[PDB]
Amino acid sequence: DVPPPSVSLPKLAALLRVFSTVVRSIGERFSPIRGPPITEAYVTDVLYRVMRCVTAANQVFFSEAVLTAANECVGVLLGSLDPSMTIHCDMVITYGLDQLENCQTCGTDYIISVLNLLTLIVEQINTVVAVAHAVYQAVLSLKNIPVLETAYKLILGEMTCALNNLLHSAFKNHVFNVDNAKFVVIFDLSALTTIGNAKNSLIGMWALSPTVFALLSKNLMIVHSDLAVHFPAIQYAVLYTLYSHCTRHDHNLLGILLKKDNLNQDTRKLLMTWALEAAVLMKKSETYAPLFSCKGLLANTLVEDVNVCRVQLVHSGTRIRQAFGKLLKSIPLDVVLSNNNHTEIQEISLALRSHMSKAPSNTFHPQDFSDVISFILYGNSHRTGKDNWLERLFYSCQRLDKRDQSTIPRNLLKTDAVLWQWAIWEAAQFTVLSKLRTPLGRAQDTFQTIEGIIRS
Amino acid sequence: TQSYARSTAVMSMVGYIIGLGDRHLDNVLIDMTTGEVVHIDYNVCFEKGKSLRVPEKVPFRMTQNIETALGVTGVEGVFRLSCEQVLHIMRRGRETLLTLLEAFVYDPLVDWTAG
Amino acid sequence: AKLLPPERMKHSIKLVDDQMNWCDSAIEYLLDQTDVLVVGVLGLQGTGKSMVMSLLSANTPEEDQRTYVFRAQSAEMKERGGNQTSGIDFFITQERIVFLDTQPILSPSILDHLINNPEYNLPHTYVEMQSLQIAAFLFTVCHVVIVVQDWFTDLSLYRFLQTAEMVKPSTPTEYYPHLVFLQNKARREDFCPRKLRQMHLMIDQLMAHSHLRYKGTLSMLQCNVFPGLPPDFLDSEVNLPLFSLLPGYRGHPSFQSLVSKLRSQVMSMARPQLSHTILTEKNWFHYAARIWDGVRKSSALAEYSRLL
């Protein structure tokens, strides 16, 4: 591997051109050799010399690696000459080839990206090669969300974060603008996919540098969901939303995804529900004592017994699916979490009344007495969870109401909800208006527009 | 529900100004996600529903019993009646933008206004 | 607030003693739930069959080894052989998921312990009976069998699993659990499309006649844009300025990501009904103990021991 440098480094470009041509030809000839095994069309047929070598084995990997690593000698300073095939452009001419089938190989894409990043670290942006500063972003945006292995986003995101620090180190490059206006659009997609907890930080910090501001709406929609990931990405999302800009918060793209996910989850009736697991959820909603010491993520993957939802699973989606499953499990006659139906209903009514009266009064209880920071804010979370629980229960408690296509039939027990009438308890326990108007206003009209209308 | 009420009010104002008819439980769809109401092809428009051939109905839009019970309280003096007034105000203020559009849609060549 | 009292463990619990003796210390942590997942692991001496169970049940990849529920090998590897997991352990995660990190089937450490100190003629034909007893107890009781392997395509493993099915006592349709083939300590090669296809073909031809659900719901969580090239089956592999701070090309997904995506599959594994009843976590222990007595004194093994 030293002879390649010893041949391509010295002067007398008359011979360096031949050395390059030969190496690049061996490369662009081995690369298509894996085409037959992949059944792909031969491409990159522009630098190949007259050498029809037939490797047809793992030798292609090593040959391409040695022919690309040798090119680093030209992609390193100083090298005040560009009479060759412009390796700067060579690493991009093979994009459509070594990036569309690179998955089936997963050996050449990363090496090409590393060589390109090395060639760019010595010179990244100056405005002679001029479109380079724009070709970098134009190739990154295309190679940034062609979903690949974890060993690729970890370097693409790193190069992007390193280029962001140079953009704000330049200066009118922001108005390019087909690259930046898309380089940031792809950052928006890479902020969540994939769920690695390492690429998001490389994106939350890479996009935190840009002001920008072109499409901060997508950044705000991403932060509105990432602020609850329950991982170290929460702090990054918070610091990005507090530093990007105001008046656009306060301005839908991502929230609709969670809405559709919950709508699709509420239309399957997967009656696994881990009845024993619903107790540790009521103990977390009606009480602060957490029985599962993250624990929510270990629940969704446990539920639904495959063999649904996206790969996000963090965290409002799972936080709401837990309550929905607990409600589906309480829909059956007996609520194993508590005593018989008349006991669980009484417990819920008491927990709601002891908290609604707290509004026009002052009283201490496990819903507000939190003797630690970051937990008194969980009391509001408890109220929101209880409100959503009651709402989705009234949803699934319509076995007598005969829910429409929005919710499939509950089960063969669709008669117990018709024989027995729980609407009487809902009417006699409409104190949820007070216990809801405090945490979430809209959590009362759902019940307020019923008790206030049923009593015509 | 708010997005629903708003789209319902706007479509009602449209069917009042434009003679939209044939409003059945199929032509008046509903987006359970966004809550907005979509209407099927306006085969009976510009008061054509008063020329049949069919029991002459004179509803300016669909306000059935399964729709008035959808808003907060009702239709008249409700969230929908408060937005229809704003719709008319924003449309009367730009009444020319629609008058000229209709004048150019009429006296046409391949529009087939013989319905 | 007392009507929902939970219960958790801190360390493993051994049902089968070092001398293959059933223990009744697990009922204390059992409950009256119906859907109870029971995942067991079988493998060679140093195949790493407890670190997987520890990282799947309670622990995570970023945590000290001494904190693992199931003791891993830290200083015993360098010393005489291995086999730190003497008997079948027990652990029920917060999700009521039972885990069974059995001893290394056909392990030289157990043979050495037997030679240095049992109703048989040779200790070599005895380490194969304990392996069979644990494989049959892991098939008639467990819902998933995580066949861990340090190196890939150990023909001995595929020829032994087919022999453990023959000893599987039926008639409590024959209940046959799943089979998750974990390639613990997997190199960058195992994570290649050609390598994946070769592994699937090999494990489908070796396990072509097993009657065990070894295929269907694995190997399609974290990969490239790859569509299903081969007849996919249950096979989850587990690995072993700014430009300067670029980690080397691992070639495989992160250890944490693979552990998470395997734990999600193990938790989501199908939990079919047991022999003839629901067999709740309490009834299960009363159903796994009878199976132990029936297999330790079964006719299948009594006849197989003579053939050895």
Add this chain to the structure above:
Amino acid sequence: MAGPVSLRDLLMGPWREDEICVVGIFGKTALRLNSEKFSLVNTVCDRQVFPLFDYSLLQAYYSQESKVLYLLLTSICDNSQLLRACRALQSGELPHAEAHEFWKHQEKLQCLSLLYLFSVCHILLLVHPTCSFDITYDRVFRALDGLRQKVLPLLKTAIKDCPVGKDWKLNCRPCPPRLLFLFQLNGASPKRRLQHALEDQIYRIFRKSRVLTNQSINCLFTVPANQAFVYIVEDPVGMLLDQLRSHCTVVDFTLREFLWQHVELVLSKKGFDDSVGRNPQPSHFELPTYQKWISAASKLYEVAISKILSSIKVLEGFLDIDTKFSENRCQKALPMAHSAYQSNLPHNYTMTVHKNQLAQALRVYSQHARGPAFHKYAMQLHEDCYKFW
């Protein structure tokens, strides 16, 4: 100039004597670019003999600079030939019984090719990239003594007219081959202790299993020297990717001393007298020559690759236990289940009633058939079909 081939090597009629010392190389290997045996052959002779890129394709290679004849076996246990076996078994050659018989025949061919190493060789190097002695090999080594003894006259009567000598023809091998197991590392002074631990474990195992007797047994002890090497944790294409990270920014023998310590005892005629128990010390060094070794190996391969040797495979009864167990299970399930359902279920009327009871006669037999079975199913449908009319 040496060609890594065995079939063509023995078919010869330069380096004539060479005072060679053959070394067998068998064992299991994982799916990798360069097999373990190939890497060992390349590291021993200090040159890449096998350049990197369903039978026992046994290949030989002679090193002139070391006078060593490495014979590497591609036994089905290896994952390189096993891949081709599963590929040929996938599309076109099988039912359960046929597949089990195919695997049994492959294992028998592997055992035969392995006996060709324990019969004409001096040193043997196992391959098991796990760092844990595979107990299965015990039952294999205990299954080779039967073939090494019963097939002993079948081999003596075919190597009589050979210059091998008196002792070689007496015990059918140049000398007791020393087993030098070689395990690869996966996770880990620390290795120096693991080698001794594995040596002690293997010694205890072979002593308790009678695999290492105090006489001219199929194997040897190697008490004074060491017979348990541990490879360092390179092989795939990752060195180039690991060199990019560096280019962008800008005691404990190793495969030769551990093997030469035993190769010198054969090249220098020292022998393999490493025996314990105050025995007669039978130590016939029998340092062969390339010509004489080839003359002996030609006949050994022609006889084993076999007039009676092919009929001795059934004399093992140590690796095909699955077949016998399944046959016994079928013989216990047929006369029980079928005999019960032929009398428990009367079905006196024989007009279109045989299948009505056979539908359940199979549900009962299925619950008692195991392994390579259901062959009696064809032999059992006749009972329910011969009792009626």
Add this chain to the structure above:
Amino acid sequence: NYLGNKACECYISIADWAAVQEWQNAIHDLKKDPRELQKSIEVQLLRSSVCLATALNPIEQDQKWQSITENVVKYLKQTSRIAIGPLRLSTLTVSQSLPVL
């Protein structure tokens, strides 16, 4: 900043999150040492952002608006406490033609 748990009712953090910013703001005029202020603000942002964390639980729109302003102002206070407030934050809240505001 470890709000007083003396019967801290739910959703009342709007006053607790606003009655504290004055503490880390009135002290600036007393001094202008600050090492004990970022720990009283950053730990205060950790709780002020909870109101927005619940804005996604279970499903809500851009709202709330009167609470996110408190989080932004607390971030501005923490930024002006670390340094002397040379350039930013201010912050920038110009229209912003929502325009309910």
